[PDB]
Design a protein around this ligand. Sequence first.
Ligand SMILES: NC(=O)C1=CN([C@@H]2O[C@H](COP(=O)(O)OP(=O)(O)OC[C@H]3O[C@@H](n4cnc5c(N)ncnc54)[C@H](OP(=O)(O)O)[C@@H]3O)[C@@H](O)[C@H]2O)C=CC1
Ligand SMILES: [Zn+2]
Lengths: 95, 208, 297, 114, 126, 134, 86
Amino acid sequence: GVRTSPTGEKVTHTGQVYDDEDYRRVRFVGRQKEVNENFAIDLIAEQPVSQVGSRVISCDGGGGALGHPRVYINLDKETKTGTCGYCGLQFRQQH
Amino acid sequence: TRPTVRPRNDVAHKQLSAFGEYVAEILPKYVQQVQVSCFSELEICIHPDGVIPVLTFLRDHSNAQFKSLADLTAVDIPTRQNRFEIVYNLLSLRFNSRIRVKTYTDELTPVESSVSVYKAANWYEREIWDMFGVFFANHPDLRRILTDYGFEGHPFRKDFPLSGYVELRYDDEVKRVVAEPVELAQEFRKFDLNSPWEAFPAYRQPPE
Amino acid sequence: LHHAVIPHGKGGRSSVSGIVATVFGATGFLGRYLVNHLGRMGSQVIVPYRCEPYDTMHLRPMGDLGQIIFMDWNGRDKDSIRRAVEHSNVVINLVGREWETKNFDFEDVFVKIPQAIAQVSKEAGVEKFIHISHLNADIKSSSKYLRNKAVGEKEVRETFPEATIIKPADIFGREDRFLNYFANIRSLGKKTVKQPVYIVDVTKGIINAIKDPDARGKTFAFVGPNRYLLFDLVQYVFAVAHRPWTTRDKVERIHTTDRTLPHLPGLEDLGVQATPLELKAIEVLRRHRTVQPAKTV
Amino acid sequence: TSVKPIFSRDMNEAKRRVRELYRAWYREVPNTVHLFQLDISVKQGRDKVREMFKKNAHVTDPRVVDLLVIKGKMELEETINVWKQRTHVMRFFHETEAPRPKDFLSKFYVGHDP
Amino acid sequence: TQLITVDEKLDITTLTGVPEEHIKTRKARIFVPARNNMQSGVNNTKKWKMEFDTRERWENPLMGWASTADPLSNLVLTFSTKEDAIAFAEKNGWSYDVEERKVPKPKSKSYGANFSWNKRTRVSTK
Amino acid sequence: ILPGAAYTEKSATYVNTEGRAQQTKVAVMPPGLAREDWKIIRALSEIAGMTLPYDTLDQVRNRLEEVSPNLVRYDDVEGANYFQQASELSKLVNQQLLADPLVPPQLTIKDFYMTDSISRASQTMAKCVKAVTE
Amino acid sequence: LGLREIRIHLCQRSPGSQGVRDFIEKRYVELKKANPDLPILIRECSDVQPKLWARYAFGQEKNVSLNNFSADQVTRALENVLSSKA
Ligand SMILES: NC(=O)C1=CN([C@@H]2O[C@H](COP(=O)(O)OP(=O)(O)OC[C@H]3O[C@@H](n4cnc5c(N)ncnc54)[C@H](OP(=O)(O)O)[C@@H]3O)[C@@H](O)[C@H]2O)C=CC1
Ligand SMILES: [Zn+2]
């Protein structure tokens, strides 16, 4: 989900871009500014919210020992989904 | 406490305590403390006037025969007024044993050089001159051994910074490697790691 | 003033001097010591190079990481000049040849390219522009070097009106073509009077001209502290060197007396004490060794 | 207040050792400028010797000036024996270092240091 | 005899190799560090510390790292008493200043005071 | 405009309402070309040709002891006597009490979060004010 | 050109400040009534010696040690300050 400053410079997933009157763009003159174009904030928002029938769900990120530490997410608020603090996967109690 | 705990060696502890009493009563003129750790190592803390009488004794007594100088060390403890702690590590191949002879000095009091007892010490305490500034009197060739030839200060003192005060770069103007006051592009990040909770209650010091 | 160009540090290698320099002709004798003296303050030096990158390698230990940006350029390509100068706050010109070539005559090197650099530096918004003429630059000069360098000085002045134009007389150093020319000649002695200036003095003059806001639009004359006749100067060179490639335009400049311009400011008006040649001639000419000083005027 | 000496019992023997060390450096300096082929003069190197001796001239402790004579003899021994290169001899002359601001005003201009 | 009497003040500044800029312009601070109020443990408030005045840290133009020119920036010395730290600062010529040890004063605690008959020190919840 | 140091950017004597003089320490340095405040005033006095008799912070604090010596005795409340004499001087001029009731300028938590230039430039304090006003 | 402020430093408990203390308990008030627009800053401190600073025009300051003085000696030094005005 990359965008571009009016100087023609790519803005990172952090949001870093040099100013127009910043001299430090001269390091990319004749070379390239390397950004990653797979923004994680746009990729985790593509994941569908998981409907579950419990009140508390566990999440380890998938893969078991290959994921993150297993945490327990409460789902009592129906205003908001319950997000994994590590992986960002979100859950909703279907009732 | 079988699998994961280090097994205590009581026979060596008893033998090193008895030999420490032996050294403390043969040489009461110089021996200040004698202690044995829980992992069974004997430390003989002496007065610095007795570097040569003690270490010759341990080299030459028929019940000591510490014919090997394993290591010679200084330790800088700045809260002590005699901030440098000179540590001799001796090995008896005859009695299959190790002893530690510790003594003290500050920046201005010379320690007597132990090269006449162990020639092994000839570089080691020379290193103690280079790293700590502890002077050794009657040393054969006392000079720096590890630092650069124009080096100012003694690096293993604890008030000496991790990086120096100067750093080198090649300078094309004078066609020479030059020394300049040190600047780091990234400062060494000091981490305060010590937990605010007591870890070892056996080592608790009494309050004021 | 932008936050990235505020000076920080104590003026060392990892410091920030706030100087973003595009030094054209940084691969020469003057560019070597100028990029050295800039890189030790912590300056962003842009070196545009024409030559093989191998022949620029000696510029690389002169600054901290990312503090020298090497980039291609061409004298007849204004796009590369704009690509080099559009981030700089100072542009120093050091482009020069002692001989004219097949592809670049004295008018290309001294009139076309400095006017191009100064025009593109004017229209890109560069604050400071320093141009290096010669002290003996004259329209009616006997040598084509000094004629084209006077024409190029006039054009640089009329296209960048705030240009600090600097007149060195004759520069000596370890890589010079003044004392090393006399040591490797093994032409004669005439009534030619010269006052040669030392390269570190010229370099400190250029950096103090960058730092001085009064030096904008001025013309400086960098001369040595002692005027020598040419004959006893060359005899002093053969004396220090333990002794008993050329062109006729070079000979015309050797027999050109270094003119006296008292109304132009010098190294002392920038705060540089000019080093006499008897302090540094041994350092220059020690290499030619396999001494009473010369007489001044 | 009763301390163990190093070489000198008081400041008279200590100043004698300082004086012999200055003599030895003064004699050594022309050989140093020759064999290292330094770009300085004998007057300039002897002025640097005098500067390094007069920097420490405020000291009133015999043990401190004993250790200063010891370290000066180590410097001289590393100079007579060619153990230093030209770089180590010329590190006394801070040639590539820019002059520091000395007054209040230029130290105010360049930064935060007192 | 083999002992001399030196009545002078102890000064080793010429021997420690330290440049004069980092002797006569630095302000040593002798202090017991305050307890981190994130935590209730007191094992870091046991000893005396000598730190120095912080100097300029600037942004590295390449990476944004914290570049420094201060060699004494990371130098924290640990002392058992206040007088050891003062003797070590005076020995090295560092101009110092000393904060006194701040202990927590003895509190008066009573669990029964949570349930008084007439005093305001009742708890309304538990 | 003369850019100055803030309280985290200078070692600086402040005195509380009970007379206890205290000192900050330098935590970070002032940003950009900003400087410590009395450094600016002293550099101005050297430009103006009326140079003040101090160069470093200790000499400023010697002057500060000369004007009142309790400003250099840190974490120390000095006792102040002579309430009788100040009260006898206060009985001289009979200023008249107004009819306006005592209203403090801060009545609710709304008026707590922004009082000075650091708090008004804060986004956290702005979130606090926006939270307590809704 | 004229006196601008007076500063009196003293201790609370040292005996050398005693007469200075006896100057303030009796003779300060009719002093301050006589000089209503002159700042006479009394500064007590912990273990300072007594002192009388006079600041004149253009930053000039004179310094009189009031140590161990009686109240009459403090009065005479202060009226020398008030009458001099250098
Ligand atoms: N004594 C002296 O040397 C004096 C010199 N000056 C002037 O000072 C300047 C620098 O002098 P100096 O160091 O001796 O010069 P050099 O001969 O040592 O180097 C000049 C520089 O200009 C570059 N250059 C030359 N011609 C061209 C061209 N046609 N296109 C692109 N780049 C070019 C060279 O690059 P590359 O390496 O690719 O060839 C080199 O980097 C010159 O302008 C000279 O006229 C003035 C007075 C005295
Ligand atoms: Zn998860």
